[PDB]
Amino acid sequence: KVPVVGIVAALLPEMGIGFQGNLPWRLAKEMKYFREVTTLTNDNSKQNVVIMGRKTWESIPQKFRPLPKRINVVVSRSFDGELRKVEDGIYHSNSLRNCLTALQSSLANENKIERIYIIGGGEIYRQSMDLADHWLITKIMPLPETTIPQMDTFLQKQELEQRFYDNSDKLVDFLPSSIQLEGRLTSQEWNGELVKGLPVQEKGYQFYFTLYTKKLEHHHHHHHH
Numbered sequence: 001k002v003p004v005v006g007i008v009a010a011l012l013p014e015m016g017i018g019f020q021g022n023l024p025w026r027l028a029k030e031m032k033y034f035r036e037v038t039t040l041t042n043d044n045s046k047q048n049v050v051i052m053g054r055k056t057w058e059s060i061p062q063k064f065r066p067l068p069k070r071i072n073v074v075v076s077r078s079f080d081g082e083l084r085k086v087e088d089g090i091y092h093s094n095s096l097r098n099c100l101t102a103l104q105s106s107l108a109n110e111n112k113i114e115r116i117y118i119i120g121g122g123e124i125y126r127q128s129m130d131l132a133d134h135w136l137i138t139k140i141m142p143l144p145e146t147t148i149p150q151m152d153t154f155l156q157k158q159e160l161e162q163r164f165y166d167n168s169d170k171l172v173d174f175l176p177s178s179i180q181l182e183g184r185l186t187s188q189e190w191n192g193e194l195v196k197g198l199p200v201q202e203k204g205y206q207f208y209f210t211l212y213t214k215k216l217e218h219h220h221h222h223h224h225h
């Protein structure tokens with residue numbers, strides 16, 4: 001009932017997302033996008049949830065966690081169960097799946113979560129292909145004289161493009177309405193792939209804000225009593 005949206009910054013063509021527990025770039029504009037998208041709501045009385053694996057949590061600088069103005073959920077298999085408040089702004093869960101079911105109960109949530117953002121990392125994203133309704137992927141490309149950074153963690157692009165289609169034409173409409181983007185929508189070929197979205201450049205990189213949406217499903221079974 002509440003949308004589940006994975007959100008990620010990935011380097012094309014491998015969709016690399018990390019190296020040695022850290023982001024492989026430092027892009028203030030990309031990070032600003034991430035902040036605004038996850039923080040902002042259309043309804044002023046709601047907040048978003050951000051869910052992340054334990055290793056991702058531990059890599060966020062300590063001055064900046066928990067992420068402000070969002071409900072933070074950290075998942076670890078060594079936590080107690082399925083959704084527990086441990087500090088102001090921090091929930092622990094021992095289960096990505098059960099945590100999502102729990103967050104979705106209108107009795108627990110009072111219909112005051114707008115969206116649930118899944119914010120990483122590799123392990124968590126692997127498991128979220130079947131859980132997310134949408135993906136906000138920042139598609140990052142090294143400009144001509146930019147060294148490709150070393151990377152060790154990757155989005156599952158195969159499974160991605162299996163389950164989802166590039167719905168970037170509807171990106172602007174999908175974002176919370178107060179966000180302001182400086183690009184206009186833009187299709188560009190890059191190493192043999194169509195890259196469609198809203199362009200920025202910063203440091204040695206060009207990047208596009210894109211939206212992926214679940215492909216239409218055939219009606220095989222509805223459960224009847």
Ligand SMILES: NC(=O)C1=CN([C@@H]2O[C@H](COP(=O)(O)OP(=O)(O)OC[C@H]3O[C@@H](n4cnc5c(N)ncnc54)[C@H](OP(=O)(O)O)[C@@H]3O)[C@@H](O)[C@H]2O)C=CC1
Nearest residue numbers: 008009018022023053056076077094096120121122123124
């Ligand atoms: N480019 C981007 O947009 C982003 C990139 N990243 C990158 O990803 C990398 C980190 O990814 P990765 O190492 O895979 O780690 P994760 O952040 O995905 O954390 C993995 C941990 O989460 C816990 N966990 C995983 N699945 C479950 C589950 N189903 N239920 C309960 N707990 C679970 C486990 O914790 P435990 O071991 O304690 O039991 C596991 O070791 C870093 O390089 C980081 O920079 C991260 C966020 C964004």
Ligand SMILES: COc1cc(-c2ccc(C)cc2)cc([C@@H](C)C#Cc2c(C)nc(N)nc2N)c1
Nearest residue numbers: 007008009021022023031034059060064119138
């Ligand atoms: C892997 O180490 C990390 C560090 C930070 C971080 C770094 C610096 C500061 C000042 C604040 C937070 C954030 C993250 C995670 C939570 C992220 C992210 C994410 C992004 C930047 N962009 C997009 N598009 N999606 C994301 N999930 C990880």
